[PDB]
Amino acid sequence: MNIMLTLLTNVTLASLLVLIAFWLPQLNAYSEKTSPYECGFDPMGSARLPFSMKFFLVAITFLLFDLEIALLLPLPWASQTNNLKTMLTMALFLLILLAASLAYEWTQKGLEWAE
Amino acid sequence: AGRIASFLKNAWAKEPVLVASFAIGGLAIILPSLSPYTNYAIRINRATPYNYPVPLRDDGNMPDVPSHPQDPQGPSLEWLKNL
Amino acid sequence: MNPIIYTTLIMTVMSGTMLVMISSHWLLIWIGFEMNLLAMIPVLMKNFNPRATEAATKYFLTQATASMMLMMAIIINLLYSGQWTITKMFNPVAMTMMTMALAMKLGLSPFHFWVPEVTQGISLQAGLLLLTWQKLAPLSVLCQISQSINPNLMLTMAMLSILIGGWGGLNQTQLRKIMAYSSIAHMGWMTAVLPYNTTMTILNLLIYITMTLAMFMLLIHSSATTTLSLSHTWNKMPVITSLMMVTLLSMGGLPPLSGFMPKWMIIQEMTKNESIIMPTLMAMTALLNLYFYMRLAYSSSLTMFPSTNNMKMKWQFEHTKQMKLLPTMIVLSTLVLPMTPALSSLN
Amino acid sequence: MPLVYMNIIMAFAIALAGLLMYRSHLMSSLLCLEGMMLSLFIMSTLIILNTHFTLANMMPIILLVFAACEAALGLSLLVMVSNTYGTDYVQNLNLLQC
Amino acid sequence: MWFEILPGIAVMAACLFIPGMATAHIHKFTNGGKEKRVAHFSYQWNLMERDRRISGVNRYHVTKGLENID
Amino acid sequence: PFFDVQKRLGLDLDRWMTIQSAEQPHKIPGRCHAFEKEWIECAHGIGGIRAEKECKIEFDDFVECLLRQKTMKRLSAIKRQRDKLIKEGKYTPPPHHLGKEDPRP
Amino acid sequence: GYSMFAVGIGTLLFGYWSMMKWNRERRRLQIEDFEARIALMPLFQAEKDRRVLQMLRENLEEEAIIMKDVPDWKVGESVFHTTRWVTPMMGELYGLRTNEEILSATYGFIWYT
Amino acid sequence: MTMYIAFILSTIFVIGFVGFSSKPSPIYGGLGLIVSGGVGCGIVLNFGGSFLGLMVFLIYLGGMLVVFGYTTAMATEMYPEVWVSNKTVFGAFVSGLMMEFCMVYYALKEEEVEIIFKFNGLGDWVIYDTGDSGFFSEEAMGIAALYSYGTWLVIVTGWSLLIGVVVIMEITRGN
Amino acid sequence: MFMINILSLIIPILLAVAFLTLVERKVLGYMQLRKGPNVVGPYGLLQPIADALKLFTKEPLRPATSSISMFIIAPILALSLALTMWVPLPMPYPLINMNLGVLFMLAMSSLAVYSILWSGWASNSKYALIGALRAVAQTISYEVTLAIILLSVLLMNGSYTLSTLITTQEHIWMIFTSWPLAMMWFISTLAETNRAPFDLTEGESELVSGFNVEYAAGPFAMFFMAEYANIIMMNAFTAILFLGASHDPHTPELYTINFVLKTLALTITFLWIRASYPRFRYDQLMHLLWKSFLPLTLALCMWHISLPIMTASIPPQS
Numbered sequence A: 001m002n003i004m005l006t007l008l009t010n011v012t013l014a015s016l017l018v019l020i021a022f023w024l025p026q027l028n029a030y031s032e033k034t035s036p037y038e039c040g041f042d043p044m045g046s047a048r049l050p051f052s053m054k055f056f057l058v059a060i061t062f063l064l065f066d067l068e069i070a071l072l073l074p075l076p077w078a079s080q081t082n083n084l085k086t087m088l089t090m091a092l093f094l095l096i097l098l099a100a101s102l103a104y105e106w107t108q109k110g111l112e113w114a115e
Numbered sequence B: 001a002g003r004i005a006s007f008l009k010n011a012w013a014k015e016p017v018l019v020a021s022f023a024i025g026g027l028a029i030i031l032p033s034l035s036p037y038t039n040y041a042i043r044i045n046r047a048t049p050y051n052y053p054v055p056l057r058d059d060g061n062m063p064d065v066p067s068h069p070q071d072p073q074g075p076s077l078e079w080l081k082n083l
Numbered sequence C: 001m002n003p004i005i006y007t008t009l010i011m012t013v014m015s016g017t018m019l020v021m022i023s024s025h026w027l028l029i030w031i032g033f034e035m036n037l038l039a040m041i042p043v044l045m046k047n048f049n050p051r052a053t054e055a056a057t058k059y060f061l062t063q064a065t066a067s068m069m070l071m072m073a074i075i076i077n078l079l080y081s082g083q084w085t086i087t088k089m090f091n092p093v094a095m096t097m098m099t100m101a102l103a104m105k106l107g108l109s110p111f112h113f114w115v116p117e118v119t120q121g122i123s124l125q126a127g128l129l130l131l132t133w134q135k136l137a138p139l140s141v142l143c144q145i146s147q148s149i150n151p152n153l154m155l156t157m158a159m160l161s162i163l164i165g166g167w168g169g170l171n172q173t174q175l176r177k178i179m180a181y182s183s184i185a186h187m188g189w190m191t192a193v194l195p196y197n198t199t200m201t202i203l204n205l206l207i208y209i210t211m212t213l214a215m216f217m218l219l220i221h222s223s224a225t226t227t228l229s230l231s232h233t234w235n236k237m238p239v240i241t242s243l244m245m246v247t248l249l250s251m252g253g254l255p256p257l258s259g260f261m262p263k264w265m266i267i268q269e270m271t272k273n274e275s276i277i278m279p280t281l282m283a284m285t286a287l288l289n290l291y292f293y294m295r296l297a298y299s300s301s302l303t304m305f306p307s308t309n310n311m312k313m314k315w316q317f318e319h320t321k322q323m324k325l326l327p328t329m330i331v332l333s334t335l336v337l338p339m340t341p342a343l344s345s346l347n
Numbered sequence D: 001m002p003l004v005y006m007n008i009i010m011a012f013a014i015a016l017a018g019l020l021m022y023r024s025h026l027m028s029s030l031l032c033l034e035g036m037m038l039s040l041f042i043m044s045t046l047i048i049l050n051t052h053f054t055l056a057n058m059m060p061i062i063l064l065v066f067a068a069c070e071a072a073l074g075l076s077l078l079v080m081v082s083n084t085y086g087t088d089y090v091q092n093l094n095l096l097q098c
Numbered sequence E: 001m002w003f004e005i006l007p008g009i010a011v012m013a014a015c016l017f018i019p020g021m022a023t024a025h026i027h028k029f030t031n032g033g034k035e036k037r038v039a040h041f042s043y044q045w046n047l048m049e050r051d052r053r054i055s056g057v058n059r060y061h062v063t064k065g066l067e068n069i070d
Numbered sequence F: 001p002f003f004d005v006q007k008r009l010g011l012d013l014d015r016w017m018t019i020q021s022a023e024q025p026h027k028i029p030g031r032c033h034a035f036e037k038e039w040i041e042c043a044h045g046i047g048g049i050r051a052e053k054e055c056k057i058e059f060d061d062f063v064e065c066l067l068r069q070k071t072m073k074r075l076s077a078i079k080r081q082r083d084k085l086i087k088e089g090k091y092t093p094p095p096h097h098l099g100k101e102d103p104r105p
Numbered sequence G: 001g002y003s004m005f006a007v008g009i010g011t012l013l014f015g016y017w018s019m020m021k022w023n024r025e026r027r028r029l030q031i032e033d034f035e036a037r038i039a040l041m042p043l044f045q046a047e048k049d050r051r052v053l054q055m056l057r058e059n060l061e062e063e064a065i066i067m068k069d070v071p072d073w074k075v076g077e078s079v080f081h082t083t084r085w086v087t088p089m090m091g092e093l094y095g096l097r098t099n100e101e102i103l104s105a106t107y108g109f110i111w112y113t
Numbered sequence H: 001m002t003m004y005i006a007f008i009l010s011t012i013f014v015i016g017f018v019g020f021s022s023k024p025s026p027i028y029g030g031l032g033l034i035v036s037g038g039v040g041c042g043i044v045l046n047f048g049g050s051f052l053g054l055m056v057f058l059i060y061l062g063g064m065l066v067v068f069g070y071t072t073a074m075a076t077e078m079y080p081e082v083w084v085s086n087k088t089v090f091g092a093f094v095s096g097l098m099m100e101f102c103m104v105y106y107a108l109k110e111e112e113v114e115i116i117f118k119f120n121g122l123g124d125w126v127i128y129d130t131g132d133s134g135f136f137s138e139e140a141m142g143i144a145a146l147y148s149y150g151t152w153l154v155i156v157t158g159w160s161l162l163i164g165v166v167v168i169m170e171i172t173r174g175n
Numbered sequence I: 001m002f003m004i005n006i007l008s009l010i011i012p013i014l015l016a017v018a019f020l021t022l023v024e025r026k027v028l029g030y031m032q033l034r035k036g037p038n039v040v041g042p043y044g045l046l047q048p049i050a051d052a053l054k055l056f057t058k059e060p061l062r063p064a065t066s067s068i069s070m071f072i073i074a075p076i077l078a079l080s081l082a083l084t085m086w087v088p089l090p091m092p093y094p095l096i097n098m099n100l101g102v103l104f105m106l107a108m109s110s111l112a113v114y115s116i117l118w119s120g121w122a123s124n125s126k127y128a129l130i131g132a133l134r135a136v137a138q139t140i141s142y143e144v145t146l147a148i149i150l151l152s153v154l155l156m157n158g159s160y161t162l163s164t165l166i167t168t169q170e171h172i173w174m175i176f177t178s179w180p181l182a183m184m185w186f187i188s189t190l191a192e193t194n195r196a197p198f199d200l201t202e203g204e205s206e207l208v209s210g211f212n213v214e215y216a217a218g219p220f221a222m223f224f225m226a227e228y229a230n231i232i233m234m235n236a237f238t239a240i241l242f243l244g245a246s247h248d249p250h251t252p253e254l255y256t257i258n259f260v261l262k263t264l265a266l267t268i269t270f271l272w273i274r275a276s277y278p279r280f281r282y283d284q285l286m287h288l289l290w291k292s293f294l295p296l297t298l299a300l301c302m303w304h305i306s307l308p309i310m311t312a313s314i315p316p317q318s
């Protein structure tokens, strides 16, 4: 209930700053002024055209390595168990396969960006 | 013996980060099985009383169960204070 | 694809299926399906081309939808009973959702649309895998929860599968789509007897897998995927076309061939449960499968189609690779009817 | 049942419907698949917390793991489709018929 | 200077002193002067709820000693 | 279909997680531990067909603990009758139900 | 390079030793306060029992008054076939009370920050 | 009854689902799914699931960032669609909104079996348990049990993650 | 009285950001043999006020090709999250006491990136899009390593509660047990706050103004405020995590002073670093995080899991 009040206060302050920024100063908007910036000149194509991603394979791999973090975050609590040999074996096993998947993609040129 | 020597030489010269990483990983894997304190950690975890110790109904045939906490029977944590 | 990677992926497909088959927990069964699909997508695209990409994409979409539905059914079942064990579903709505999810995984009508397209889009080896090994897991799950399932929905989907397999197979000249529609009809037969006797389901599945393995291996040996390309095999390998002719008649279900045993066993079991009408429809409809098998046998073995001049060069070369189990598969596909009482060992 | 449970099941039904009815982009369907997983995670978590099944607190994490694998799988296929056609449209993949 | 950088650093340090000191003083002011109670687990929350009930003024911070057991 | 490798080898690959009454960490119990214990012990070894008829009482109690459908119905009935009798002024709620109780430890 | 690496490893070993001692002491302290909680638990259990039973009795009397006109209503009738004690649902205990107590009872601990 | 916070949160959850299921531009679909993930975090937090809520929020933030990159890379069109730039998207959005409205009305003013079963409402607080014990979080204990009880689960999930890396490398190879 | 505390936390933080702008200008000035602002107010004290007033009385412009709704939402999200990230910090007491404070910090930080992505996309300008895609790449580069480093360091603490970090370090700073993780963590916080040499998203030399080039006046000032607030917040977190200050329950002002001095030192170190180095190419940053930091981080996670068990040094509060 305190965190909800905090979030509400912060969003309200930011929104009021935007409101002031838009309603206090004088506004003189014309087409030349509101046009897209490309350093002196008119853009050739649209900025909504497909923009190639050369690290597309590291982006997919990030999705799988980010879930390794969800499996490793309970580790401070897992350390409190009685069968520490099973916990340590399992935790070590998990990080070893994470290192092996990194070694696989590295040696197969999966970390190099497309050319 | 001399193949791996020059191999680790070239690795330390070209990829010291990977050398240190494999050293630290291998140590983390093998050292816990040679330690006399891993059992101490298991025992420390077992000595932590998270829930209530439910008493047993005395039937006159329990020579090794205390009838009051300060009685001498039962487990002792003396080893822990001196640790 | 590196051979070691291909072996690892085939082993992951098989281990996902075995996880589905050995598990007692619904979550582990779901994990088995997930692992199977994950390893199976690359096997479809092993020979890269736009058609293989499209087939793998349609396959992934269908199977992932089925997976979400399956998980939702598990969660509703847990909500109405704090149970994770796969026995008999507690909630009727969860059972409907589960049945439809497994029917989508199997490709039963009306969820049959994906099977012909994906089968046509991939190679003959991947088609062999897709039409034999990919059936074990959902069928085993269905066998476990058989008492719980509603007969009306299951039998509706089974009769639809038989009808649609026959009708769709009538129109094909590509051999992979013929095999796919054949598979759809066979699945209909397997699921029609499921609420009565799971041993008959297992027997039907074993005989179908034997005949399908034999057919796919014969199609690989004579590297043909169309009807007209298979019309040449007589002028290079006549024994292959004769064996294919007999295997085709066994698929048709004609006696004294093995293919007739599953149909015969299923009809008999159904009559015991006072169900004369469903079986009469099923057999009269399997007549369509027999028709297009007979058409393929006409074009391939019983008559001789014209050939080409370059076949003379092929006359001089033996096959580089030989299939070890092809001979055994043909014999088990044709000559096993006298051993029918051995089905008791399946229960 | 509780109002909250009804809302989560409705979310699953809506995402399932979204997946079923395709438009032009494949990425939108992939998003619908993710949405279904999100609703399954929430529903299972609510049921598990409510009944105090302690050991079942780990299954939503497994659910997320597999969901990530499925998401990764979906994006790979989209990369290959887009490389073939220069577009991720569903209509392009009509080469194979029934 | 270089020591002319120090006035801005001092203003920034004075601005950063405020949140922690204000939180400490507000905690002490609204918790009977004794360091707002921490309830990370439900046992501590149960202790706080029992304290609120026995105070008689519906405040957890008010503490009843041995003068309350006749 | 179901090859029981666990039972043949005595492994416990996933049976530790199938039910709510089975060995939780720190002995934390399930909310419906006793009802489930009772339904499991009532139906054990008699098979699925007999268990659904002969253990329906235990299972109905278990489901009531799980979802609490009858309890919410009874509470709704009581509160509707309270609302109705209060609107007409026939019934006056006690002080200990309006916020003026003498709280006890 | 040797000197830098040696200073680093020595720093780490000193830190490890210090943290080992400090965390052992912390674990002893945690055991001690857990045992205080254990010594206190019976009194809390006794008064929790009395509090729950008193709330149930008050609800029962108010329900005997409220549900007298409805024709076929057994006051205090259980919804279970079993006759053993069932832990009361939160709604049953606070069903006939003010929204502030219901809020404090359901979300009081979760929201306390 | 009390503040019906979780009801508002679950309604916003459904609204975000309608937002991204209407199948508009992916930039707005991912926005809708982020909103849904955040309010689902809140829903789970209100029941005692702090770790699970925060975890699903974190995971979906990472996933939607990858999806934003892929949308600019392969999902772009000269005029990306919003919920009001298309009759088809707007119609799906409105139909989902008032379908949720009809479900919620029919459920809270009388007691109907929609598809599975029925419900009267009362707010979520009624089904709680009033349990009083512990120096720990039971959620944290059950999740930590993955390393002592759930050895088999750890094995199968680790294998699937390694295989997933290998699989994406195989799929995106080309040739 | 709780709103008094919220305002007490927020008003000061914005003032500290305002004067961090001046301190950075003067520190970079003196490292460059010049002075920086010394005219507007004694020693440039009034320069931040003039800058703020100049920005909020200038005309804000909405681009013709831009998506107006996301264009306006992005800076609101940025500033509101920058303010929110402060509430669980124990100084020595937190405004909000959380069980999982570290994990809340991670989630809010991970959500902060969307404002940069959305603002760049909403702008519908080429340079803004290039900046936004650089932000995608930057998150992919440092996100996995940053989380595993926190996990490894936190194992000694025993929980994810931020106030426990004070007790963990009653006798020694946690940097004497994990200085390698501390180094990698410092560089990851440089990358996570888009700061030189890791400030690829702004790309001032390369892309002129990156994601915020279109932005003018008040909306622009909001992005600036958010970034500098994040710079102070990260350093404060770094101070609490690796250089725990002794805390006296009966005199918390001493802890407050110690903590503020340490976070000021770390912020000035950021400014120094910016004055000293050349900018990393964006592909290179990914290589740096994935081929050097991630292997060492995996090995050190293994080591920090094994070490408390080997030595019977495991911490309390499961």
Ligand SMILES: CCCCCCCCCCCCCCCCC[C@@H](O)O[C@H](CO[C@H](O)CCCCCCCCCCCCCCC)COP(=O)(O)OCC[N+](C)(C)C
Pocket: A013, A016, A017, A019, A020, A023, A024, A025, A026, A027
């Ligand atoms: C730190 C965050 C919080 C700060 C605390 C202060 C909160 C500030 C909130 C933000 C608003 C302040 C902006 C400052 C200028 C006012 C902008 C606007 O509200 O004024 C005019 C509003 O006027 C409207 O245009 C119409 C006037 C009357 C409208 C009728 C509304 C009903 C009132 C009935 C009249 C009877 C008396 C009412 C009082 C009881 C807009 O005119 P316009 O020229 O476009 O905009 C440019 C403004 N310029 C000229 C200063 C540059």
Ligand SMILES: CCCCCCCCCCCCCCCCC[C@@H](O)O[C@H](CO[C@H](O)CCCCCCCCCCCCCCC)COP(=O)(O)OCC[N+](C)(C)C
Pocket: A083, A085, A086, A089, A090, A093, F012, F013, H148, H149, H151, H152, H155, H159
């Ligand atoms: C017959 C064929 C065998 C070889 C091929 C098998 C292929 C599958 C892979 C391995 C099979 C799984 C066997 C392990 C099952 C786990 C359960 C069992 O082992 O007990 C555990 C014993 O733990 C041991 O550490 C076993 C785990 C070691 C396995 C690590 C590597 C093995 C997998 C290798 C293949 C996996 C894929 C490839 C990756 C390299 C836990 O026992 P414990 O904790 O006392 O008591 C638990 C009860 N409590 C909680 C109440 C206290």
Ligand SMILES: CCCCCCCC/C=C\CCCCCCCC(=O)O[C@H](COC(=O)CCCCCCC/C=C/CCCCCCCC)COP(=O)(O)OCCN
Pocket: A096, A099, A100, A102, A103, A106, A107, B011, B014, B015, B018, B019, B021, B022, B023, B024, B025, B026, B029, I291, I294, I295, I296, I298, I299
């Ligand atoms: C048993 C320990 C396991 C657990 C610890 C490890 C956990 C995490 C560490 C492993 C992460 C994955 C490592 C992936 C390896 C990639 C190899 C590679 O291909 O990179 C080489 C670089 O590395 C190599 O040279 C290949 C391997 C050479 C040996 C590397 C280390 C092997 C082990 C060395 C130490 C042995 C054990 C420690 C003993 C210490 C002495 C007492 C090429 O570099 P590029 O980036 O492509 O350059 C591009 C510009 N030209």
Ligand SMILES: CCCCCCCC/C=C\CCCCCCCC(=O)O[C@H](COC(=O)CCCCCCC/C=C/CCCCCCCC)COP(=O)(O)OCCN
Pocket: B014, B015, B017, B020, B024, G008, G009, G012, I180, I181, I182, I183, I184, I186, I187, I197, I238, I242, I273, I288, I292, I293, I296, I303
């Ligand atoms: C007894 C058991 C002990 C176990 C082992 C523990 C000891 C470990 C010993 C080694 C520790 C080394 C940790 C360092 C981690 C990264 C080191 C590294 O190699 O990174 C560099 C790159 O890292 C950098 O140089 C940083 C770039 C950005 C610099 C930013 C400013 C510089 C730093 C300022 C001071 C840092 C202060 C950090 C701590 C602050 C206090 C909290 C590698 O990149 P390249 O040289 O290009 O080679 C790659 C191809 N082979």
